[PDB]
Amino acid sequence: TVSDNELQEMSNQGSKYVNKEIQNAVNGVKQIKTLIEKTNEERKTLLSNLEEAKKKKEDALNETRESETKLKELPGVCNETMMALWEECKPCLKQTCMKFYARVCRSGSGLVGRQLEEFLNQSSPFYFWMNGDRIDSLLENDRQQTHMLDVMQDHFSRASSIIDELFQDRFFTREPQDTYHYLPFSLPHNFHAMFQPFLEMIHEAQQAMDIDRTVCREIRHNSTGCLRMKDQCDKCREILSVDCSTNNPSQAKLRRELDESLQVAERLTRKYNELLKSYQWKMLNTSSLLEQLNEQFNWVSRLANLTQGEDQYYLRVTTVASHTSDSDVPSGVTEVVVKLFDSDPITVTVPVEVSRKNPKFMETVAEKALQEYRKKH
Ligand SMILES: *[C@@H]1O[C@H](CO)[C@@H](O[C@@H]2O[C@H](CO)[C@@H](O[C@@H]3O[C@H](CO)[C@@H](O)[C@H](O)[C@@H]3O)[C@H](O)[C@H]2NC(C)=O)[C@H](O)[C@H]1NC(C)=O
Ligand SMILES: *[C@@H]1O[C@H](CO)[C@@H](O[C@@H]2O[C@H](CO)[C@@H](O)[C@H](O)[C@H]2NC(C)=O)[C@H](O)[C@H]1NC(C)=O
Ligand SMILES: *[C@@H]1O[C@H](CO)[C@@H](O)[C@H](O)[C@H]1NC(C)=O
Ligand SMILES: *[C@@H]1O[C@H](CO)[C@@H](O)[C@H](O)[C@H]1NC(C)=O
Ligand SMILES: *[C@@H]1O[C@H](CO)[C@@H](O)[C@H](O)[C@H]1NC(C)=O
Ligand SMILES: *[C@@H]1O[C@H](CO)[C@@H](O)[C@H](O)[C@H]1NC(C)=O
């Protein structure tokens, strides 16, 4: 029973909130620019944290490495029971890792066990006694970290270069027009010739940024991952318990010096990995923000080419209805059918508190309808 004259006034009223979107849209672009530039500075101060943290880690590693070379100058095994535990440690390790890879991981259990037995035969129980596995598994982790930062940093600096060049345009500089509440908003006269350069630069930055199941990957990569399971086997934790204090007191002291430097180096390596993980998030954030910037610029452009025609309503209200009229409508809402930019009719649901005698009725309808329209492309 809604008068056509009212539907027309709703169309007049709703069409004027389309011009507020073009303004809001440009602000969304400029607000995203702020967040990207904010994250960029947070990345830089994080990089300065990594450069301080790298030195401390590196110094701790040279002291650890300086310690293991002095323990290889004295390479003999003190107890001769060690040599007999080695040939009962080795078979046990092979089985516990094979059993793991088959149960937890995948196929190739025997392949892993073979690669391990071969390496353990080219190995000695002294290497175990001096925690030689932990030294190697730390020095390699240190190199993986150095590589990860090298890659991430160079991906980031390229994208940051493309982005800073894009943000040197004055389209992104805040203007008073963005805050006008009574006077209308107007895009630049040459937006069609600014759209494509910008969008491509956002695409180029998105490209630049683009880079237990964990143990299974490692055991597949190198069978030495099995040596994380020394604890499970008895003879091996006994090789590690051997006191050489009576037999070779000089070896025992150097081993205690190494273990000290080892724990420090590991602490500072876990600290570096947490900063690296924080840097990774800044990288993902920036990729997430660039995707928004793309969707926002398209929305501005989409709005721009659709609103240049003033011959008919931007938003035309076709029907208003309630649970009285349709009765398929839910009870506490009214449904407004809308033809936005002469596209397929969009249906909007607004609660009766905003529907009945509310001046923010058509502001709600228009904002909702435009949100749906935006989703459609
Ligand atoms: C790494 O070195 C060890 C040395 O202990 C190799 O294990 C040894 O392998 C030989 C032959 O492969 C075994 O000899 C056989 O023993 C059985 C039962 O004792 C006997 O019936 C056979 O006639 C033969 O004498 C030996 O026992 C075994 N020792 C241990 C402690 O396992 C191992 O094969 C080497 N790894 C590689 C990849 O070569
Ligand atoms: C060689 O190693 C064995 C074990 O690795 C040592 O045996 C230990 O001896 C003490 C003293 O009798 C016992 O209390 C421990 O329980 C033994 N450990 C094990 C695992 O059996 C042995 O003392 C070492 N020999 C030398 C000369 O250091
Ligand atoms: C440890 O060696 C690395 C590589 O040469 C170097 O970066 C670091 O400064 C060294 N630390 C010390 C204390 O010499
Ligand atoms: C596995 O690790 C050992 C020592 O950590 C190394 O000598 C060997 O080359 C590694 N193998 C592979 C395939 O990475
Ligand atoms: C952004 O970074 C923070 C910490 O740097 C992280 O907690 C958050 O998950 C990141 N968000 C995205 C979308 O990557
Ligand atoms: C808007 O229309 C122009 C052509 O008039 C076109 O080049 C541009 O890609 C359109 N933008 C969107 C988001 O559809």
Author numbering: 25 to 213, 239 to 260, 281 to 446
Give the published text.
Clusterin (apolipoprotein J), a conserved glycoprotein abundant in blood and cerebrospinal fluid, functions as a molecular chaperone and apolipoprotein. The Clu structure is composed of three domains, a coiled-coil (CC) domain, a small helical domain containing all disulfide bridges (hereafter disulfide domain, DD) and a C-terminal α/β roll-like (AB) domain. Structure-based mutational analysis demonstrated that two disordered, hydrophobic peptide tails enable diverse activities. Resembling the substrate-binding regions of small heat-shock proteins, these sequences mediate clusterin’s chaperone function in suppressing amyloid-β, tau and α-synuclein aggregation.
For crystallization, we designed a single-chain construct (Clu-Δ(214–238)) comprising a deletion of a predicted unstructured sequence including the furin cleavage site. Upon expression in the presence of the α-mannosidase I inhibitor kifunensine to generate uniform oligomannose N-glycans, purified Clu-Δ(214–238) crystallized at acidic pH in two distinct lattice types, crystal forms I and II, diffracting to 2.8-Å and 3.5-Å resolution, respectively. Crystal form I contained one copy of Clu-Δ(214–238) while crystal form II contained two independent copies. The asymmetric unit of crystal form I is shown in orthogonal views. The dashed line indicates a disordered loop, residues 261–280. The α7–α8 loop (residues 261–280) is also disordered. The three conformations in the crystal lattices differed slightly in their domain orientations, with root-mean-square deviation (r.m.s.d.) values of 1.5–2.0 Å (Cα positions). While the DD seems fairly rigid, its linkers to helices α2 and α10 deviate considerably between crystal forms, indicating structural plasticity. The N-glycans in Clu-Δ(214–238) point toward solvent channels in the crystal lattices and are partially ordered (gray spheres). Importantly, the model of the WT structure contains extended unstructured regions, including disordered tails at the C terminus of the β-chain (residues 199–227) and at the N terminus of the α-chain (residues 228–244). These tails are generated by furin cleavage in the unstructured sequence of WT Clu that is deleted in Clu-Δ(214–238).
